[PDB]
């Protein structure tokens, strides 16, 4: 009739992996123990210089790790002689990850001496009309319970409400804010998380810019934009996630700041004097994520990625992984009293300068299965149609051309050695692959292979079978 229908269908996408036959060769890797000691509210800076003393690194902002893995294609192996570069390729698939959080319990305590607060509104105790001048208070807060983790192999997409349409393309005033329109963009390391007021920008969305704890008074806040990644017909943005989260209202409070909103006043029959006047309606709930418990860990636990949950079966492309972690239960603050100098005949608040630190621990334990790719000319035709770039990077076909063409003469320096001629002063640039910042994790020398050794290893080896078990554990009775 229309007809239309789409007709019927035009083209359609086959599974990513359904010709990739896994091999019995495994390799293994681990992590030494990554370390940062940051400060959660603000990077503590040098007092006459731009550059950090303590960086803002915390579990309350996204921890995005770029993990870059060995070339599997050319890699150390014990017996291979099947391999034909044109009719087969190799690729890593990681068959498990555990992530050790070596930090003890302890949340990220954050607060502002000047948090925007007018009156109590939970049970309340007074009335007030429109706001006076200067109603902010010293209040501190714990952020809502949020733990998630996601594993991908291409940076993942966040959403946030950004700064949308202007004041002139609507009829919304300056003092009422340009509209909040959901602007989607990739999650970057050092980006703040969802705050319990929604996940939004707060740089240009707080003109007071001291409504909330210091950390979130600037920068974008994101929430993972699961709908785009999972409706993706390739699903390389992610392919594994899990989360446990909750929030509750500690207490309702009202913002300070004059109503700019439109309250029709002829929807209540007038009081007398004070109750004929109109209060602030600028309610905000304060979130809480209190009661930490160690049966609420989504961490610390192996997740065998024999298959993924995406539309990608976890088989790497570009040989890299992205691991985004928020952990609010581990982001522990520390206390101690330190004297600036000795002069204490008594305790003095003067002399004893308290200073908080934050300790952030990460360790990543990996077990990799090697996989082969069966390829023929017809299959390849399809592989390029999905992603040109994967074949071109592997370049066991193809060509981009080998090279060639020259290597020489000669670069750089030029001269070397002895020389130190001129020094030579630069000479830019060579040669970076970044566009986003990421906490680099090199795995290209952490490679090992044993599964009778390494704890993570052993649980995988037992789960399988002979050779070898018992090699423990197992239990861990009772």
């Amino acid at each position, epitope marked *: 009739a229309t007809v239309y229908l789409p007709p019927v269908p035009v083209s359609k996408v086959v599974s990513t992996d359904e010709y990739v036959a896994r091999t019995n060769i495994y390799y293994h890797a681990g992590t030494s123990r990554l370390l940062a000691v940051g400060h959660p509210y603000f990077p503590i800076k040098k007092p006459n210089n731009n550059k950090i003393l303590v960086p803002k690194v915390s579990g309350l902002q996204y921890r995005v790790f770029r993990i870059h893995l060995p070339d599997p294609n050319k890699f150390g192996f014990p017996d291979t002689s099947f391999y034909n570069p044109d009719t087969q390729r190799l690729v890593w698939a990681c068959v498990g990850v555990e992530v050790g959080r070596g930090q003890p319990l302890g949340v990220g305590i954050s607060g502002h001496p000047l948090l925007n607060k007018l009156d109590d509104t939970e049970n309340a105790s007074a009335y007030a009309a429109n706001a006076g001048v200067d109603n902010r208070e010293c209040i501190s807060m714990d952020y809502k319970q949020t733990q998630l983790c996601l594993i991908g192999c291409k940076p993942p997409i966040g959403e946030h409400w*950004g700064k*949308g349409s202007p004041c002139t393309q609507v009829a919304v005033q300056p003092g009422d804010c340009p509209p909040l329109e959901l602007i989607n*963009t990739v999650i970057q390391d050092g980006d703040m998380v969802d705050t319990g007021f929604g996940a939004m920008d707060f*740089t240009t969305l707080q*003109a007071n810019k001291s409504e909330v704890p210091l950390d979130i008074c600037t920068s974008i806040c994101k929430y993972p934009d699961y709908i785009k990644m999972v409706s993706e017909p390739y699903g390389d943005s992610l392919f594994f996630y899990l989360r446990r989260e909750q929030m509750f209202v500690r207490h309702l409070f009202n913002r300070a700041g004059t109503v700019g909103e439109n309250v029709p006043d002829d929807l209540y029959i007038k009081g007398s004097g004070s109750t004929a006047n109109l209060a602030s309606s600028n309610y905000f709930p304060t979130p809480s994520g209190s009661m930490v418990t160690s049966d609420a860990q989504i961490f610390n636990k192996p997740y065998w990625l024999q298959r993924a949950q995406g539309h990608n079966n976890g088989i790497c492309w570009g040989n890299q992984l992205f691991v985004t972690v928020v952990d609010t239960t581990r982001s522990t603050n520390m206390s101690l009293c330190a004297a600036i100098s000795t002069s204490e005949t008594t305790y003095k608040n003067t002399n004893f300068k308290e200073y908080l630190r934050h300790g952030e621990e990460y360790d990543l334990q990996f077990i990799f299965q090697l996989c082969k790719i069966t390829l023929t000319a017809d299959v390849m035709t399809y592989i390029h149609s999905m992603n040109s770039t994967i074949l071109e990077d592997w370049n066991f076909g193809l060509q981009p051309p080998p090279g060639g063409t020259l290597e020489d003469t000669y670069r750089f320096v030029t001269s070397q050695a002895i020389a130190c001629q001129k020094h030579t002063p630069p000479a*830019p*640039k060579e040669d970076p692959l970044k566009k986003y910042t990421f906490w680099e994790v090199n795995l290209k020398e952490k490679f090992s292979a044993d599964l009778d050794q390494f704890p993570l290893g052993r649980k995988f080896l037992l789960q399988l079978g002979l050779k070898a078990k018992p090699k423990f554990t197992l239990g861990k009775r009772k």
Partner: antibody
Amino acid sequence: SGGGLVKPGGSLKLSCEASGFTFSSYAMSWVRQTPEKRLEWVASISSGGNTHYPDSVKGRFTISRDNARNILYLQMSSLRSEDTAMYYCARGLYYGYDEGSDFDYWGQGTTLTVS
Amino acid sequence: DIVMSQSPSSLAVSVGEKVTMSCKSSQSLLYSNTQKNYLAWYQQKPGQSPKLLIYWASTRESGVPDRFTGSGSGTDFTLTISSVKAEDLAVYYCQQYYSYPLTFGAGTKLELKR
């Protein structure tokens, strides 16, 4: 603000003060015009403080922002005669509806002569 | 860096004529993954600073006359003025904001015949 005559090898610090809009909400950017009349990207800095420079000035020019006073800076060092140009301060805009970027506003420019 | 090549270097037309001008990039400005083109066009009148015309390859900035249309995809882009007016004499630039360094074309100078 801040251009003028400077000898080769010297240093110079340019400033750009914003007005009429929310400075903290926009990326700011430096663009120069050499006598040949073609625009050349000088440096950019993200709202989060990540700097970006081309090889022509990387290691010599530094871009920075004062978020409190709303001032954009461009510290130049080891100036070369080839750096002679009109330098422009400019904003950047992100358009979420199309996921793109442009330079919506820029100043009158200040002239820098290395001679 | 991505080299932006504009053509012709200049052209002269009378009031009412249609003009087209080329901007070709040395690398693709089409992000395969989302199919967006990262291209903007600017207009610099004599004695003035460049004004934004087109961005995201084909999106016209508010206040720009509808006679200016930007088109193209990938590496080959065009700016068309459907009917040139006397006030359109200027140097037209194109600029890629796909990757760093952010780079500009050489410009096309439009002059008026009378």
